[PDB]
Paper text:
[name] plays a chaperone-like role by extensively interacting with [name] and stabilizing the α1- and α2- helices. A positively charged groove around the catalytic pocket on [name] is found to target the tubulin tail for detyrosination.
To improve the structure resolution, we prepared a complex of N-terminal truncated VASH247–355 and the full-length SVBP1–66 for crystallization, and determined the crystal structure of the VASH247–355/SVBP1–66 heterodimer at 2.2 Å resolution by molecular replacement using the VASH21–355/SVBP1–66 structure as search model. These two structures are almost identical, with a root mean square deviation (RMSD) of 0.28. Two copies of the [name]/[name] heterodimer were observed in an asymmetric unit, and they are structurally identical with a RMSD of 0.16 Å. In the complex, [name] folds as a single α-helix associating with [name], and [name] folds into two interacting domains of roughly equal length that form a V-shaped configuration. The N-terminal domain (NTD) of [name] contains five successive α-helices (α1, α2, α3, α4 and α5), and the C-terminal domain (CTD) contains a β-sheet made of five antiparallel β-strands and two α-helices (with β1-β2-β3-α6-β4-β5-α7 linking topology). In contrast, in the non-canonical Cys-His-Ser catalytic triad of [name], the distance between the serine side chain and the Nε2H of histidine is extended to 4.3 Å, so that the imidazole ring would not be well oriented for thiolate/imidazolium ion pair formation by serine/histidine interaction. Instead, the imidazole ring is oriented indirectly via a water molecule, by twisting the ring to rotate a degree of 45.6. Approximately 1314 Å2 of the [name] accessible surface is buried by [name], which is 36% of the [name] surface participating in the intermolecular interactions (with the total accessible surface of [name] being 3652 Å2).
Residue numbers in the entry:
A (entry chain A): 49 to 299
B (entry chain D): 28 to 60
Write the structure that this text describes.
Amino acid sequence: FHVNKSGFPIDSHTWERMWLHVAKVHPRGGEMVGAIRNAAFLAKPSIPQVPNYRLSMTIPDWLQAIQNYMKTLQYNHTGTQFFEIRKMRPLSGLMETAKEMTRESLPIKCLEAVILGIYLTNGQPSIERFPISFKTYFSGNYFHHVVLGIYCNGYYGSLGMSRRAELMDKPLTFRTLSDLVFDFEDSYKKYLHTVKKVKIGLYVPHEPHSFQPIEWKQLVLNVSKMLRADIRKELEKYARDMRMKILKPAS
Amino acid sequence: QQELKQRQRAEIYALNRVMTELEQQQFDEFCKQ
């Protein structure tokens, strides 16, 4: 679909394309678009305040504030992604885009939310962050989704954004990386998606090297071909290496 | 220009609300089938 590459304000080419995609998708497209565009009395959306960690906060309450900020930005259902995310760009370049998301304050999709989640948790050394990617199959098509796994005080959880409430944030109550991943697999089932690939990245450093990117694919499992005990065996081995060993990036 | 950014933001959020309701409706209709 469409990705804004023109900054803010969005330029005519990108803006007109956005409206043409939604007029097509929506059953009452033309009258829908006509009712919004140059409508004189649209509501001005509030600007949510950027959450910030203080010692007076539990880290679950802080993570909840981060997730609530992302939910307030809303999942982007327009078909036009407003912030370009080059996955392999250095972290320092991605954090400037995260900051731009806070300033422009627009809806976001799953990958933007992962970048945003890294940015809003960089201060805090008791949180380890690592991307969790899914390639799924539904009705003859492949789908790609990613969330931000988090590790804190022996527990696993996640931040993220999805069309589906069960496919983004998970509380910090998962005792193992496998329980977290399996919860996403079971959640995908509810939507008739089969998980083809699970990809787990490395910890995103709180203090990255100058050109250091995110490692998205340190572990790749073809889960649809594996029995669950083999999946758990591979995940727990890898998660144990994460928690101890310094692993060499695989990309 | 800031005024254009604000105008665009207001239309983006009206549009996102409409597309969100559409996606919810389509989800429900697919469950019914």
